[PDB]
Design an enzyme around this catalytic site. Structure first.
Site, mmCIF file in Angstrom:
data_model
loop_
_atom_site.group_PDB
_atom_site.id
_atom_site.type_symbol
_atom_site.label_atom_id
_atom_site.label_comp_id
_atom_site.label_asym_id
_atom_site.label_seq_id
_atom_site.Cartn_x
_atom_site.Cartn_y
_atom_site.Cartn_z
ATOM 1 N N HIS A 40 9.695 2.091 -7.063
ATOM 2 C CA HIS A 40 8.570 1.408 -7.688
ATOM 3 C C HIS A 40 7.214 1.736 -7.061
ATOM 4 C CE1 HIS A 40 8.513 -2.199 -4.870
ATOM 5 N NE2 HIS A 40 7.266 -2.263 -5.296
ATOM 6 N N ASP A 84 16.254 1.011 -6.565
ATOM 7 C CA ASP A 84 14.858 1.131 -6.187
ATOM 8 C C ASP A 84 14.759 1.926 -4.892
ATOM 9 O OD1 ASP A 84 12.130 0.796 -6.264
ATOM 10 O OD2 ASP A 84 12.143 -1.276 -5.588
ATOM 11 N N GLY A 175 2.779 -4.723 -0.932
ATOM 12 C CA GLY A 175 2.132 -3.826 0.006
ATOM 13 C C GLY A 175 3.097 -3.394 1.103
ATOM 14 N N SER A 177 6.199 -3.060 0.260
ATOM 15 C CA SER A 177 7.133 -2.351 -0.601
ATOM 16 C C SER A 177 7.313 -0.883 -0.221
ATOM 17 C CB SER A 177 6.705 -2.498 -2.061
ATOM 18 O OG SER A 177 7.029 -3.796 -2.524
ATOM 19 N N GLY A 178 8.578 -0.467 -0.157
ATOM 20 C CA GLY A 178 8.923 0.888 0.223
ATOM 21 C C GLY A 178 9.175 0.943 1.718
#
Ligand SMILES: [Ca+2]
Length: 223
Positions: A40, A84, A175, A177-178
């Site tokens: 994402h 994801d 923020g 995320s990942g």
């Protein structure tokens, strides 16, 4: 990171910042030329920043490298956030050192109860938005699947795992995320999603990396 603490400078050397003119996601360096992040967080052009602490100040340890190949998991479902996971091949290998180091892939899936480290430059508030300058850290346990599924009825797949606190207050947020979920030196999760930030009974949901070790290696070898 809501309710976390500021990490010691360069104490999480595998943490990278995905920049598209501004910091938008995080990631983990898994080898001198590959970074793993969340599907994402995909963007056609990304600049990966390594050796970061203060995201807005040049300190002398940074290495800015552009992404050459951005590969999302072929079965990523943008509506459920299933699979994801994304891989990024840097345009050139980075210089590995103290502030820039790789993190290990999981040899097995971590049991519930395992204490892990979550880090990122994401939102620090439970309500509203505040993007920090310094890398934030959070120590959180891997939660039992039963509690994960109970918190998110009909939305938790076997490629997802909850990490955090059912009582709220501490959690990852937009923020982050990942970003990495590292337990005992191995990457067990990737910041994926969750309802709100740091809310009671709504822990963060992460991509279960141990389910993708093969795909990661195969893709790295094939690219
Ligand atoms: Ca900096």
């Amino acid at each position: 990171i809501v309710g976390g603490y500021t990490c010691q400078e360069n104490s999480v050397p595998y943490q990278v910042s995905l920049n598209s003119g501004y910091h938008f996601c995080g990631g983990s360096l898994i080898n001198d030329q590959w970074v793993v992040s969340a599907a994402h967080c995909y963007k056609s052009r990304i600049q990966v920043r390594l050796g970061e602490h203060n995201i807005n100040v040049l300190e002398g340890n940074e290495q800015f490298v552009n992404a050459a190949k951005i590969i999302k998991h072929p079965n990523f479902d943008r509506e459920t956030y299933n699979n994801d996971i994304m891989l990024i091949k840097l345009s050139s290998p980075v210089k590995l050192n103290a502030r820039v180091a790789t993190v290990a892939l999981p040899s097995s899936c971590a049991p519930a109860g395992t204490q892990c480290l979550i880090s990122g430059w994401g939102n620090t508030l439970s309500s509203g938005v505040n993007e920090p300058d310094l890398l934030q850290c959070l120590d959180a346990p891997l939660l039992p699947q039963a509690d994960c599924e109970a918190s998110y009825p009909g939305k938790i797949t076997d490629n997802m795992v909850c990490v955090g606190f059912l009582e709220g207050g501490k959690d990852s947020c937009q923020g982050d995320s990942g970003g990495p979920v590292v337990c005992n030196g191995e990457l067990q999760g990737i910041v994926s999603w969750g309802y709100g930030c740091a809310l009671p009974d709504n822990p963060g949901v992460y991509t279960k990396v141990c389910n993708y070790v093969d795909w990661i290696q195969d893709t790295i070898a094939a690219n």
